Amino acid sequence: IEMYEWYSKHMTRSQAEQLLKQEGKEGGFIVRDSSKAGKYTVSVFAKSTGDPQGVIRHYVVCSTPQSQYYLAEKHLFSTIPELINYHQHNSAGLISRLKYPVSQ
Amino acid sequence: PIKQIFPDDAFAETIKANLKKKSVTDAVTQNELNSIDQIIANNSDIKSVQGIQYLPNVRYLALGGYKLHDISALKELTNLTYLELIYNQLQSLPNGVFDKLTNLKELVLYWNQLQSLPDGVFDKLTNLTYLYLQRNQLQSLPKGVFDKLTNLTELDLSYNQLQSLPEGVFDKLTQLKDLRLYQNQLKSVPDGVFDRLTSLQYIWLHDNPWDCTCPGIRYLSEWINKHSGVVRNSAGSVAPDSAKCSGSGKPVRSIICP
């Protein structure tokens, strides 16, 4: 899961938003451990919602009982890198395609 | 020259920040301008980008602002691969404005006031992979307007005022995975309009006033039935019945034509 630029394990939601907004890029995103237990959350910056300043959306990664992961239903993946790679190539019903990994 | 290359004072300030310079009045060389790789300005007071033709190596341009109305100087930016122009007052595009952007991969044009597209506007954009034209005021599309975009994978036409689609309009988009037509004024589509979309994974057809008179509605009805797993609703979930008849409210795919 690490080795990937888009992963920041400790990053909190507040840290994500400031850095996403400081980046200002459409589809800027950060993958971080959720507030929850055993959950992952994808934070995406996008300007497609009616606010030209851009909004931050926090997408918690879903889990089937069969231990696959999904953000967009019908697109089940066995691995977070596999999930993220798909959503880096397909908007797939999200506020934006994951266009740009934001870090630090 | 002391950044009076850029007459719009908001754009010049944007250049100032980009180059980390001291002030509007500070001087700049062409060597500095050539180093500009990306420009971002969200929700800006920019109105004209008149200086930009002197930044010949920018590849990422994101300009959003309620007052932007003059983008003719963009035609020269040969090396763009990402272009985002959003939330502005543009009601049309200057003819040939994109003709030199042969490396453009993504074109983001949402939340504007575009009523039409210039004929052949996208013809030189053979590398374009993503095209977002949603939230505009388009009522019609020029014939063959997407024909050269053979590598296109996403096309968003949602939230417009589309009265009709041109026959064959999607015939060349064999790599298209995502097609959004929801929230328009389409009463019908030409027969066979989707049949070459052999890569389609998502299509959005809801919030159109479909005319379910038979036998016209037959093509759309049989296509949705055959491809029901591809039809997505507002919430991005799979819903084949989201395409509804304007009178009855029945699902389009529930209409059967003798």
Residue numbers in the entry:
A (entry chain A): 276 to 379
B (entry chain B): 9 to 266
Task: Give the original sentences from the paper that presented this experimental model.
Bruton’s tyrosine kinase (Btk) is a central kinase in B-cell receptor (BCR) signaling that is expressed in the B-cell lineage and in myeloid cells. Loss-of-function mutations in Btk are found in humans with X-linked agammaglobulinemia (XLA). Repebodies are engineered non-antibody scaffold proteins composed of leucine-rich repeat (LRR) modules that can be engineered to bind targets with high specificity.
In order to demonstrate the importance of the proposed allosteric interaction of the Btk SH2 domain with the kinase domain in regulating Btk activity, we developed a repebody binder. In contrast, rF10 showed no binding to the SH2 domains from its close relatives, the tyrosine kinases Abl and Lck, demonstrating a >500-fold selectivity for the Btk SH2 domain. Even in the presence of a 20-fold molar excess of rF10, no competition with pY-peptide binding was observed, indicating that rF10 has a different binding epitope on the SH2 domain. To further corroborate the rF10 interaction site, a recombinant SH2 containing the XLA mutation K374N in the interface between the SH2-rF10 showed a ~9-fold decreased affinity compared to the wild-type SH2 domain. The coincidental strong overlap of the rF10 binding epitope with the proposed Btk SH2-kinase interface led us to hypothesize that rF10 may abrogate the SH2-KD interaction and thereby act as an allosteric Btk antagonist. In line with our hypothesis, SAXS-based reconstructions of rF10-Btk complexes suggests that the conformation of SH2-KD is altered and the interdomain interface is disrupted.
